Amino acid sequence: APRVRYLAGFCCPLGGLAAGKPRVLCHEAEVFLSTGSELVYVYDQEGGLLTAAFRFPDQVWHLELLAPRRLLYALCARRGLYCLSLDHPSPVIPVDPDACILPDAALCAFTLLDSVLVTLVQGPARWKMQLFEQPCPGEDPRPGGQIGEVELSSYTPHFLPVLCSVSPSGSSGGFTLEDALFGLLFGADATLLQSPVVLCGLPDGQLCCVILKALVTSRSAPGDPNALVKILHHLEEPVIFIGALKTEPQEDVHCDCLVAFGHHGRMLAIKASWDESGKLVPELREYCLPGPVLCAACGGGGRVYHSTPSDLCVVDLSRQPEEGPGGLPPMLCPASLNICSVVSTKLLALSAKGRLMTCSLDMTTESAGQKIKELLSGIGNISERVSFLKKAVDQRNKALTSLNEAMNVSCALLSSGTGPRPISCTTSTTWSRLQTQDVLMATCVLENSSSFSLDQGWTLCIQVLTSSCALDLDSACSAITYTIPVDQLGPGARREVTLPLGPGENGGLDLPVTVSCTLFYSLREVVEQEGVCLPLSRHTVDMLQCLRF
Amino acid sequence: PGLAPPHTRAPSPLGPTRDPVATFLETCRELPPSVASIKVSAELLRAALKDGHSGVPLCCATLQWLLAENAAVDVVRARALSSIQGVAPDGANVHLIV
Amino acid sequence: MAVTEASLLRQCPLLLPQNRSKTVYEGFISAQGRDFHLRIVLPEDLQLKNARLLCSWQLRTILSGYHRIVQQRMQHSPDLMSFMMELKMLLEVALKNRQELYALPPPPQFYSSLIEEIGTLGWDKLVYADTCFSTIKLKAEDASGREHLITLKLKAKYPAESPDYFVDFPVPFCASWTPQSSLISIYSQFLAAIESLKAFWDVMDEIDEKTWVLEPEKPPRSATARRIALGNNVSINIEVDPRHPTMLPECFFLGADHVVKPLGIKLSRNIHLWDPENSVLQNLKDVLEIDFPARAILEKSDFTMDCGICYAYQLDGTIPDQVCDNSQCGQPFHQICLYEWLRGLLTSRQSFNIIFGECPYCSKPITLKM
Amino acid sequence: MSSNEQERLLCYNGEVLVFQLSKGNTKTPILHVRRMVFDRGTKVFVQKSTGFFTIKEENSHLKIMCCNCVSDFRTGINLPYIVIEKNKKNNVFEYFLLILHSTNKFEMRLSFKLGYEMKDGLRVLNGPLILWRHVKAFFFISSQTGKVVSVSGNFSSIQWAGEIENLGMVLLGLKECCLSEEECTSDIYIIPPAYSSVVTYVHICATEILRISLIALTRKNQLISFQNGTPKNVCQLPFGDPCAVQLMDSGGGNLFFVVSFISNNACAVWKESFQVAAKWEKLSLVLIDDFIGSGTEQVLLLFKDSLNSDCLTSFKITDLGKINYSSENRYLVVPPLETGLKVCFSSFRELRQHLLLKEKIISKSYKALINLVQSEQLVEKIWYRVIDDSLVVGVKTTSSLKLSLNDVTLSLLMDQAHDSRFRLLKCQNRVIKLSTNPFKKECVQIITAVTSLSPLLTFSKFC
Amino acid sequence: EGVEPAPWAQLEAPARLLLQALQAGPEGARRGLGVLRALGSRGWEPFDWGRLLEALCREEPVVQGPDGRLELKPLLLRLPRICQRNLMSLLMAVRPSLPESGLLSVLQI
């Protein structure tokens, strides 16, 4: 009867908890959690009380879990990797540095297989992938010696890269494909050897796979990069999430479809085709979703459960092959980042506020009447706000057309149809008289011949250039500029403006004087550096016009 | 400007909607047409407008004398117009009939 | 305007030339209170013989099966302007066809006012409403205790325009619709129409009680027609004018040409002994000087044992012979009729001297061997 | 409310926790917790569990001071606290910070034990942390330290308190002033001191690098945005005396600022367009949680205690959207209507996308417009001074611009949204070439302009 | 290549009989009647004339005359000419029993 329920919420910062880092992991009703602080939490999933609380040093960056071995691996940021016996003889507990193994310190990201550990180590520019044994007998929980390192030569530097395990059928914390796909992506080597393969997405968005049978090397026997790591598709944004998906749904599920995500939301589904050549080709799409995407998961039957920062949204891929677009719902759950999926679908979270919460998915007399009362009121709430948005849409639309007349005017002027039809401005000279003295005025007529009504946003500049030939002594006044807003000009309609050009100082007027008239359109005015200025006429006032008889 | 000889597009004045000090104050801090008329003796106006230029006795000749000082009197002499709608210094319209 | 400098702008406001050489337009196109994405590339010249045009998926869905239409239009439209005209016309069509998807109603009026007005009626009356709240169907009671139904179809604005009214009874229904008129007004009108044809219904009631009505079965309130069988293997069809029901009807006779004569003659004799104070049957019994049988056979009354295309027995020695392999149809046919039916349909497929193809009435596999 | 029998409420992970001191007779008063939850089947609040705490000393004047969540510094875990005063009539006031866990059981942490009565700005914060005042003297008792401490700086009113990235803790009381609550004392990009007259409560919401996208509200019943103290998007509030805001989210984009007022009233206002969406009255209290298990915040309105001498009668819970819940067939009508509501929802959410698409093309089109007309930085940089009744604008050129070959000018253009009027705007253009340590070698060519002030200063301001 | 299905292909099945029937030479009109009595006898005793009367007026696109001229034709002019002439016969035959709203839309065409 509560399709969503709360367990415990945490010390957030402002905004709330960022992405990459935090992790949730459910065991049976044992549950595990990194809030991307130094602290990993353990909850009784029946009763949202805490069993077990752990302090590490420095900011936990990722978890995994081996159920057989009853162990948890926990990456501290600038330290190496600390492993915990789950029985583990205040409910707060520091780790001792004993539980430390491979303090490599320079390691971002790691995964598990069976008896194998795969780390990914930051360096200088070249990231290299390392690989260690992991002791299959219940022993001291050891690394062993490194089998394998290579350079992700492809990779040259907030966003923590991620790795994945992909084992084919017959041969555990990963994904099995169907042998058709497995074969299509990686190829024969991989298929033959029943090699579990590891996919690294990287902050660039680059999604590289590596074949773990093939990563065995020594000082006398180094990794070649180009052999050994290969590069599948390059999303141009950081990678949040990889999985595989059982489309065609007709515990070890044999998936058919490989799923990637970006951050800004290019997602990438991949499938088997075998089409049109009787030959295997991989169906690619690169759909282009909403939002920053901020965690993802896979749940029963071709359904991805993902976050925007708005809302918790979900996609279907189930039903050519896969699909034209993934147009996509929420379920009206807020931004949880840090999601997971256990299959019975019942998925679990940490809410971007700070919240640990568990989503379960799938006539009376007169309180039918109260139902009606309420339902109208709901629509009475919505409708207002719909309407709001239309009016906004009006402003937007009117503006485009408002712009559209701008593009049309601009284009007509930049064309030489050989007569400056659309807008013209004439200038012409007029001896006035002031206080005593005869003065020279230049009348500046703007005339609209064309249809186009020079709306608000438009504005006229005139510039009054003295003599040209820049001097030894820089004059007092190089030139003057006058500038006016044009309003609503209309077709046919006109403005005139007269200036001074004439002497106050010296009785001193020297020629040629030129007056170039021009137009700016203001983009902002209707609501990178931004306007457009457009060049109308350019008239020379010479010694002939300034004569008077 | 409506009566004006050229019938050429001159922009309409619409002088400033507020004072700059007034705009300043409003921003920092957050109908019938009025009439007057006169009547006057035709005999007085006759005897005075005699030196009688030409033209229709009264109303039009009254107008020629009330705008005798205005430059745009000889245009109203030609069109012999007894009622016109001028503008002002403060941009408002004002309609005067005789 | 004449030119597509100004006519274009005036007819496609929201299509902006990105490019100076007015070759790429992009933005929105308007249609029916609804503005939609459009991305319309030209080549180096202003030629639609080669042009790119993509949609949002929202538009392509809405120009479902006009795709080939619009490709043709692009090759055979002269101008961009006329092409936009054609396109907007073409949207208007699409949406006016699929009007079942495309309401936002004006809730503040709509859904509330409907509850108001239905409240004014009373809550017993409504029987069906479709969940688009388009169709509502209402119930009315005769003085005679007979149920008659009324469909209303409602538009986007119910109270502005007439509701479309669909009803059974046989004379053309008239509803004085004002913007001030409402459901109670059309309700009153409907009750008026019931009480008016009251006599016609008492007459049809009387017939369907006392007699072996044959050819309409569970007859609607629509029907004016009542094919009575009488004695056995002879029948009379009686069509009655609703305004003057009691008045003599046009009546005529099916069965044995030998048995039809004397009845057809005695009718001729006794027709002036019709009277509109007694019932149709109380005039017919004393006009034709007979009684009718009171359901002489109620189970095998009659199965139209007829072609179900031509509605005749004996087409050129062929009998209704050819049948359906179905319990729910069992409709006979003729070889010739059914061959000329199924061969015309697109669904049916032809083997050597056999046609497998859909029974006309029930659309189930039926086989014809010539 | 605040007394020996009187209670307070609060919210915590869907549920509404009821703290009630109760005079026990054998003894002194006891804290009794009811942790209650909304059934949805029965449309009421059902007790889900209880907790008690036995108080020792046979003294009166026991008093709740406030209740909220916090997040403890040891664990990280939002816990409901309570602050109790114990007054012995000794001119002594204890002030306990007591925490309740999962277990419907408590833990005392600070006794804190003053002699003078505590009042004004008591606000409890992250590392369970009590900060108060008398006569313009701020003090704080962290639960790490255990000891009374004084705030170094001298401030009037202390509007905001709370943790941020890189700092740990902060106080904003004078908007310039930007403290620590470790080493008592960037102030750079806060709201203007122009606001400092009229602001009476604040509420940040987002922070980056320093930049604080923040809200206020004023004595004048306003409500304001700021992105680096840039006052955008003002609303107006219907009642007077606007105390505080919260936030609520309510599903996609429906984000509201739910404001409590001193006149026993409240509003919500619709961020997306600063608009009052709704107004309520008499509001004994308000809390903001997903009381349903939908996954979107709702809001609870409690109505007055005159009705019954009981708390959670007269209540009302809503989204301001799909949910409104509260205290002759008709049925064939419902699946129409419900289905109806749901379609408009699809319409809201779809127009919302629609609008943004429009915006994006518009933007697409200016940039199209700007490349329609058409890299090398010809001009360094703009500056300006005021000389008396003279606006003097200038700039610095680079090498690229040869004044030998190009007559150049420098106009100004006013913004018409201010300038309703045709005043023509003039400016005078000078070239200034200055030789730079002549004792290759640097010439400084600068172009600059002038015009008058009091023409522009019509609207207190322009751009 | 040049398959077109009949214009009434998409319609509710009993229309599809009515107009399938009226395709067939001058006794089309009885066959129309035959159908009406044969659907008073099947389980939808009514036949929703307001369905069919909309469908007739609603227009669709055609490109005829040259290879290139776009037009909007209603159903009535688009469907088989003998089905026209008999429809129209049948509608004098059941005029009383149709609503006016539809009829007038038909006629105007």
Ligand SMILES: [Zn+2]
């Ligand atoms: Zn036949």
Ligand SMILES: [Zn+2]
């Ligand atoms: Zn059949």
